[PDB]
Amino acid sequence: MLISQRPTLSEDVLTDNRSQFVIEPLEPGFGYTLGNSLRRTLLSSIPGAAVTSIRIDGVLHEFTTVPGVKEDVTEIILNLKSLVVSSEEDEPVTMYLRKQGPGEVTAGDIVPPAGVTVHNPGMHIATLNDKGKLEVELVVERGRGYVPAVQNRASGAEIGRIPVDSIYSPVLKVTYKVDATRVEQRTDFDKLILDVETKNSISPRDALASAGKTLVELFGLARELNVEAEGIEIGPS
Amino acid sequence: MLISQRPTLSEDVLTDNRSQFVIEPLEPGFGYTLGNSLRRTLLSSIPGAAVTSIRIDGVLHEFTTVPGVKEDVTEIILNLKSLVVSSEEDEPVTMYLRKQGPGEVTAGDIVPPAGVTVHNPGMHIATLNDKGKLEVELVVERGRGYVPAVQNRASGAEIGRIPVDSIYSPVLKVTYKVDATRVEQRTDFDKLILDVETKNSISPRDALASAGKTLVELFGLARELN
Amino acid sequence: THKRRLSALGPGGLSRERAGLEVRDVHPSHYGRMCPIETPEGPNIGLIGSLSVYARVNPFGFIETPYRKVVDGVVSDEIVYLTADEEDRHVVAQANSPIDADGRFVEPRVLVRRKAGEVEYVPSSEVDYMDVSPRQMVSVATAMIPFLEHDDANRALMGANMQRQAVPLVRSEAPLVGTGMELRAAIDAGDVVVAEESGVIEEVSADYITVMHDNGTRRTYRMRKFARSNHGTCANQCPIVDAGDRVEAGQVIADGPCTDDGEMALGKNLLVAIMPWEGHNYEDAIILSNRLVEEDVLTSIHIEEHEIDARDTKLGAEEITRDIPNISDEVLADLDERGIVRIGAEVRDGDILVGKVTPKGETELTPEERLLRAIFGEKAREVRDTSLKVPHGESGKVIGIRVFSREDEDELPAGVNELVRVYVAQKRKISDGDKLAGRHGNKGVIGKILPVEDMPFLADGTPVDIILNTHGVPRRMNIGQILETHLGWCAHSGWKVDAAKGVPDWAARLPDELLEAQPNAIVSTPVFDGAQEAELQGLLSCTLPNRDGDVLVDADGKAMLFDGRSGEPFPYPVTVGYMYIMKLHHLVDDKIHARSTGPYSMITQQPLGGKAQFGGQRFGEMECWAMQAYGAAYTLQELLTIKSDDTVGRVKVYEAIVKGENIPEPGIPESFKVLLKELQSLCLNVE
Amino acid sequence: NSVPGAPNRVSFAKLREPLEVPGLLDV
Amino acid sequence: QETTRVLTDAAINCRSDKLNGLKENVIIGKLIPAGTGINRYRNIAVQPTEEARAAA
Amino acid sequence: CGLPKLMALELFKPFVMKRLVDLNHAQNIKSAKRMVERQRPQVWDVLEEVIAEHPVLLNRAPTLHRLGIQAFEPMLVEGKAIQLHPLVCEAFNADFDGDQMAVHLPLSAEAQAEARILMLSSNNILSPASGRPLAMPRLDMVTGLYYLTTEVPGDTGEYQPASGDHPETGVYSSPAEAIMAADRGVLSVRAKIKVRLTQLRPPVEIEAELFGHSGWQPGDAWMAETTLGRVMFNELLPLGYPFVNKQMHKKVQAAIINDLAERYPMIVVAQTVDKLKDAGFYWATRSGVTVSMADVLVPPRKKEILDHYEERADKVEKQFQRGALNHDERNEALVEIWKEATDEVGQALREHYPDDNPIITIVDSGATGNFTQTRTLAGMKGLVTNPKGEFIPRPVKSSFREGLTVLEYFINTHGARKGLADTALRTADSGYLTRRLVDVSQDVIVREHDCQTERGIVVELAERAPDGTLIRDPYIETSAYARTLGTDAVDEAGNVIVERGQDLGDPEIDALLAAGITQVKVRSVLTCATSTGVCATCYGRSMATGKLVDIGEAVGIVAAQSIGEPGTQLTMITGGLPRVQELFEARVPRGKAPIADVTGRVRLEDGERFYKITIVPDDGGEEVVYDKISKRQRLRVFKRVLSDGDHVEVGQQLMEGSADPHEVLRVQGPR
Amino acid sequence: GGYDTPLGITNPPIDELLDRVSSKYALVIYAAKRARQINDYYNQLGEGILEYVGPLVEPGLQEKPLSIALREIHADLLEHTEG
Ligand SMILES: [Mg+2]
Ligand SMILES: [Zn+2]
């Protein structure tokens, strides 16, 4: 068959990592068969690294107290989950963060080992009051989607280690809705409007193409059942 | 931690015209959306063939009776709107139905041309007595979806031609269910089990292949074009 | 139910505006004679009613009602027909009273109805009459509602009044759950061909059935095919017997418009969910599936009749011929050589049906038109052109042409040479704006027709057909539409009450052969003696599996639906079932009207009214108060002068719109200058 | 009931009735 | 209300009208004296400011 | 609003007939007319050009108030039904069970300006009668937002903290992380969590202690212990609006839209109301509100309640059959017993139901309906009226879920038909009253800005207590809100707290109540001093716009429509719509109660089986004598009760009933 | 302040238009008279030149002159005097 039109993906660029896409005109109703899949594969299928578990010295009995700093542990934890970091060792690689004296600790005080990198060195984490040295140990690893707090099944090797939630997705918030453009000449077509916000590791344009690749490699499992079957063809550029 | 292994598709054949497909392993929360994106393309955009318009010898319109038969013409329209016929060429071809004498005009009396075929010789169309003669030709076209009866005024046909609604869709019923394992040490996956049943025109794996082809054609537009 | 109607207005009776509140109410003597439920809804409540089922009219004109007389506490069978006078002299028991096998009441005290209408509780020796049945107080149309006693009386009134407005579909499937009044309201209404004497079917065809009786002679029944009803609907009539069958006297031999196998079938059985879905079924609107358009579930046939007549005028005679004054040769393609169209020609809005041309005598042309005739060389053609064209907004095929002529001795009135009628068929689908309704007074127009892919489907992949709203169920007090939603699921799939160790406690008072039932079985709940609330809960716990072992509906009656549009399941279960819905005769194609400029009236030059003419919508008094309260002076002045009455402003506005200029200032309305003349003709010096 | 070619439609009626429905067009 | 007995004692008194309510301006086809129909609102003169007529 | 393309092609015929000759599609006007009447395929591309930004008036009969005519812009929709917006249906009082509406086309430039500015649908949100928002969410949107913003204790992924061996595990870095968690199976939307919001403005109590001097929230972080659903609700509300954190009833949403209409501009409220309807439909379809017969729970002890009250009724009937009490007395005793039985089974049904039942969530969220109908669904129908109007002493003890019997249904039909006949006659009577009210008051229009009178009425405005500082009067928002001061308010030597000429909104009323003054002289239209019509400052704030009234508003017609519109919901010495008809026609009532003419002492005398009342003054003078007052008219309580040995005021009422306005005008003057 | 981008009929917003006039009736007559001036320009332009000036803002392709009038009012390009 033949589509007798052509959809076009045309990006409209908002703020630096908040682009908005439109796809028009799709024959009815194809906004919903591809928009929900595009949102889910944007959210749960792009690889990336994040922090899994941290340990702070001298924190065992009361998990909301750090001696010397302002924030309790339930704030230093969620100041570390929003730490964008890309890694290359597909295995847990640890980092350290040690700082003495009064002053405001940022994310650039961390020492990255070989391979990992922190994409925002100007992110404040704690404010050391006076003469209190903070010593944190982080664990960075790769994955996808958001996988919650995996429990400490080491059971004795990790005394004060606490596990945190993992935001592995480079994208953060994707929403979609469809419309009904040109009901008479184009005869009641659709218009899918994506709205993808990323963290600053990759662009929202590069994060749309990776999910397109993982989806065209996913419906090709069904297309490789009978190659010369007749479906709707689009046409070249 | 990423499971670096690709999902594989496997197939169980239950009867001749329905089957199940197991796709595993997927990401947690991705079974339902994948199964629904396959169902919504299967149930709407699989091309097939159906009869577009018929013409009987003694009648002028749709709202009359043929002398000798038991059903009126609109009942023969509603009985012909359930034929399953798989064509092979682009042009509208014609098939014929000639019967004379008492008996039961079924769908196994249609003589088709070269390229097309009828897939149910047990469908009942009409019933005749000794004074009845049924002589009717049918026009078999190729398309997809569902399109209502193209008007006679919006065509060049004469008084005799009767436009019939067309349902070009071979698939009958599509469903799924997932097996969300999700063990509590965060090695989770899904397992999608599609269930496709078609109307004897195409096999289920020939119905899934065209849906996969349509989705590969469309989701490639969101690739490095932009 | 247009017969058996008892109307109070008319000649010699009371009026519609001079009628008080006393005659409209239900007197307590209406029990068994007039139905309290069925009555019209407008300004006629109480003035029009209908007879009961068992009522009967006295030789004097009073209304009788049967009763079973009971002697010494023992109910006999001597059925007496009482009138309303001597009903009060005795006392009358209740029909659902525990008679124990001889006539004796089980309990020593019976419910009873006393003289003034009081509802006493009297011991079982003063009782001297009993009702012959329940549902005795109720009419013919009201007795076809399953689960009547769970609906409020306003909604039961609307359900009885919306059953006589349904259209005849092209397939007419019998109801899956009904009362016992379907089979008797079809063979007595007369729209079903009934075999007269017991014979054996010799020859059947779609026009005629010749049966051969046991004693010699035959009989041929002629079916009426595609006859026009009084209201435009179809009157198709098909046989249901084959060419070798043995029939008996009284047996139904051919179905009618709304019948299936001899019993009434006004609508179809449709899978219904009671979830509110995305605001398309918002405040009584109904959304459908696209399966009902693809498979012609709610398709009807409508037949219109157009009539023209060639008369003798004062200047000659009007002639019906193909020779029409100045017109194209393209608009004469379907007309034959003698005027009228060909049978089978598809017409549309504006096409000529009967070519009729009337002599005009004389008028003199403008100089511009007389120049335009001399350039192209065309004659004056003094005869007019008054053809018969189809009205605005209609189309369809042409079934039949009936032509009466003076030259063939037909009976026509004085000075009518020819009279031709043309019938136009039209196969209407279902569309958004059409009005569907259930049996229980629920109704509502179609607001959306979803494709079959995005529609909440079950675990089988079977999508639902309609989606009704939740918020219309509890506040209208017609939850019987839930109960037939439940039983309609059971009758779809069939039950099997497993009495392998004993009959269970809920089914102790069920009859036999309801302990199990094959799928798609038709059941019947009578009106005031039907399925109890404690037996639907029993039949819902055995609801036999579809194709695989898979119970789709649990004991509560609710199912787990997927989402057709997003894919993931709905988080809570949803009541599904099979409801019987009917397509009412309030279609969109008969209601839509528009007017730019049409015919104007005679004395005052305001536009006409109604869709038969063109007609404009009336901008009355309260709309003027609303526009004055807004402060919009100019829109009010435009609606009241240059759109109705300003006779030189009307064509000036049209010229200014076409040439693209500004709308001029309004003048004086030509309905005000009529008032000055009718005041000066009353001898009043209005200056 | 008492109509020869009727479809067999089962009833939930717990009572029996002595008098059947009359000839509805006798008014 | 009571069109006969109002019309017959308006005529004896030779009573005149001035058309100041918004029920008689509705009848005679004039502009009602409320909203955009009063003088201070419908006698607005509109002209381009000069800078703009100036800049055009 | 959608429009059918056939109706819009026939409606806009000269405009398309001009535009397809400006474009070279037809030679002249005659071929253009033929091309339109034949519906050639080129004209649908021209109709979308000539239809854009050309508003149409939509109207639905009957046009009760002035909001029954509203202008919309059109957009071509396939089909033959007008697509109405689901929020204006409250203003039209339209339901979608087969109603029809009329479409008018304004032609000139003045009428197009009046449709675009004066009568647009998104310029009229509030009502001119009361000021409440009429385009507020309703039946489905209310239960959608109620399922969204409620809080379920013990839900999935709650705020745990059980620290000592593992951390809290209820915190979230942002609402984006909470949405990603809820896309897995870990979080419910109605579960209490602790998000960290960086884009929503905190409430005044939290922003005061967190920032204080400048508590702005475009980018500053604060932790909030809420649900996820209240965050997804508050993202719909505007950026500067404080965080709410409440369960959205209908009264809460009325308060929110009223505050948005007071403080924010008119184009913000319309977009906010649209976002609220979108989220309301999307969560009403996920709310899981279905009706089955397994959800209609019967009370498990209905039988013993009905047995106990049946025993009491049996004792009353035995006393009647013995001969102790007569006919009407046993009628009244049965009525009292079964009323108590009805209310007791109502309490049992109310306490039996779970709080998340689908039948009880629709009532409790204020979506639709009330409780009494639910009490007639499961439970007891109660007493049923007569055709006469009295009560049947039987009563109906079945419910509409158990099903009624034959006799109870036949009894119920009496009231069920009398109500329908009364509804028809009542909506016949109300239009006559609206017509007379429009006709008497059409020349009351606003004429100038200020007449500078100093007369004014006084307002009751929150009477003392018993010690007790000052509790509010219940009806302040209808008598004291949206007025203007005639005098400067002054506290106890104080200062001028609220000066002359202010709008008397909410903060001024709260300041007057804090200052301890319980009476305010208010400028009004009864004391306006212009020649023809009223003035702007004497009238006050127009309730529809929210600001001062303009100088051309026909406020008499708005005042007549505001009284004439809700007259259909007035069921009923008289109490219903005949009482309003009696007051506005200034007739003498049938239950005419005498009033005093002067202060003094009342001699109450009985006599020849009616009454006698003679008031003797304290000045003194000629006594006042009222002879014949029938025994059905009982005397009148204020202060024991009236009888003899009594001091009378000037215009004190002497019997109960209704004092005629002519006597109180003659005695106590116009004020 | 900051609301959204308005679409269709409601652009320019009626709140930022009522900062220019006294009440909403003067806006009606203001926009009506300005649209009648633009419509008188578009006709006496297909003949000799005349004095009715406008539009002062660059219009769209097919823009009704009432919306052009409202965009001229919103950008403070006209003046008016009440009678
Ligand atoms: Mg309605
Ligand atoms: Zn004043």
Numbering used by the authors:
A (entry chain B): 1 to 237
B (entry chain A): 1 to 226
C (entry chain C): 450 to 1136
D (entry chain C): 30 to 56
E (entry chain D): 1227 to 1282
F (entry chain D): 441 to 1012, 1024 to 1090, 1097 to 1128
G (entry chain E): 27 to 109
Pull verbatim passages from the article behind this deposition.
The bacterial RNA polymerase (RNAP) is a proven target for antibiotics. RbpA, essential in Mtb, is a component of transcription initiation complexes (TICs) that tightly binds the primary promoter specificity σA subunit of the RNAP holoenzyme (holo). The switch region sits at the base of the mobile RNAP clamp domain and, like a hinge, controls motions of the clamp crucial for DNA loading into the RNAP active-site cleft and maintaining the melted DNA in the channel. Here, we used single-particle cryo-electron microscopy (cryo-EM) to determine structures of Mtb transcription initiation complexes in three distinct conformational states, including a complex with Fdx at an overall resolution of 3.4 Å.
The second class comprised Mtb RbpA/σA-holo bound to two us-fork promoter fragments but without Fdx to a nominal resolution of 3.3 Å. One us-fork promoter fragment bound upstream from the RNAP active site cleft as in the previous class, but a second us-fork promoter fragment bound the RNAP downstream duplex DNA binding channel, with the 5-nucleotide 3'-overhang engaged with the RNAP active site (as the template strand) like previously characterized 3'-tailed templates. Local resolution calculations indicated that the central core of the structure was determined to between 2.8–3.2 Å resolution. The overall conformation of this protein complex and its engagement with the upstream and downstream DNA fragments was very similar to the crystal structure of a full Msm open promoter complex (RPo) with one exception (see below). We will therefore call this complex an Mtb RbpA/RPo mimic. In striking contrast to the crystal structures, both cryo-EM structures reveal density for the RbpANTT, which unexpectedly threads into the RNAP active site cleft between the ZBD and σA4 domains and snakes through a narrow channel towards the RNAP active site Mg2+. The most N-terminal RbpA residues visible in the cryo-EM structures (A2 in the Fdx complex, R4 in the RPo) sit near the tip of the σ-finger where it makes its closest approach to the RNAP active site, too far (25 Å) to play a direct role in RNAP catalytic activity or substrate binding. Assigning a clamp rotation angle of 0° (closed clamp) to the RPo structure (blue), the RbpA/σA-holo clamp is rotated open by about 12° (green). Examination of the high-resolution RPo (closed clamp) structure reveals that clamp closure pinches off the Fdx binding pocket - Fdx can only bind to the open-clamp conformation of RNAP. Using the ab-initio model (low-pass filtered to 30 Å-resolution), particles were 3D classified into two classes using cryoSPARC heterogenous refinement. CryoSPARC homogenous refinement was performed for each class using the class map and corresponding particles, yielding two structures with different clamp conformations: open (Fdx/RbpA/σA-holo/us-fork) and closed [RbpA/σA-holo/(us-fork)2; Figure 2A].
